[PDB]
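Q: Joint fold for the lines below.
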Amino acid sequence: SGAIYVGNYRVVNRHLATHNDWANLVWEDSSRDLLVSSTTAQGCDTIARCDCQTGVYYCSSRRKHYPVSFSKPSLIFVEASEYYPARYQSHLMLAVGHSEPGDCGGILRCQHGVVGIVSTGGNGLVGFADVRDLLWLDE
Ligand SMILES: NC(=O)[C@H]1CCCN(C(=O)Cc2ncc3ccc(Br)cn23)C1
Ligand SMILES: [Zn+2]
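A: Joint structure:
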C-alpha cells in the first residue's frame, strides 16, 4: 500500500483505489495501473521532472529503502491477475530488487523528487509506474 500526495491530488495504484478515490476521480488509466483523485488538504510530496535512471525505493515487505538502477518507461507484458487480464502495461520501469505482493504503492525517488510507485514485481525484480510525464500534477 502507499500513495503520492502532491498539491490537491492523491496518486495511487488504480487496482488499490478506494470508493472515496473513485468518488473524487480526476484521471485513471488501466494500461498504466494509475488513478488520481482530488483532496481537500495540501499534499507533502514534489514530483521529479528528469530522465534519471537511478534512485531509491521503499520496500514495505522489508521496512527498508533500497537503491536501484531502472529501465526507462516502456510497454511491458504483465501476466493475468485477479485485477487485470493479461496485457501490456505502459510507462513501466523495471529494476533488480526485492518486491512481493503487498509492496505496491512504495515510492521511488531520485535527487529531483518522486519518480513513481511500485506496481508489479517478482523473482528479484521490481516494477514502477512512472509519474514524471504527468505535468498537470504541479497545478
Ligand atoms: N500492475 C499489475 O498488473 C499488478 C496488479 C496487482 C497484481 N500484480 C502482481 O504483480 C502481483 C504479484 N505477484 C507477485 C508479485 C511480486 C511483487 C509485486 Br509488487 C507484485 N506481485 C500485477
Ligand atoms: Zn531525477
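Q: Anything notable?
A: The radius of gyration is 14 Å. Helices lie at 19-23.
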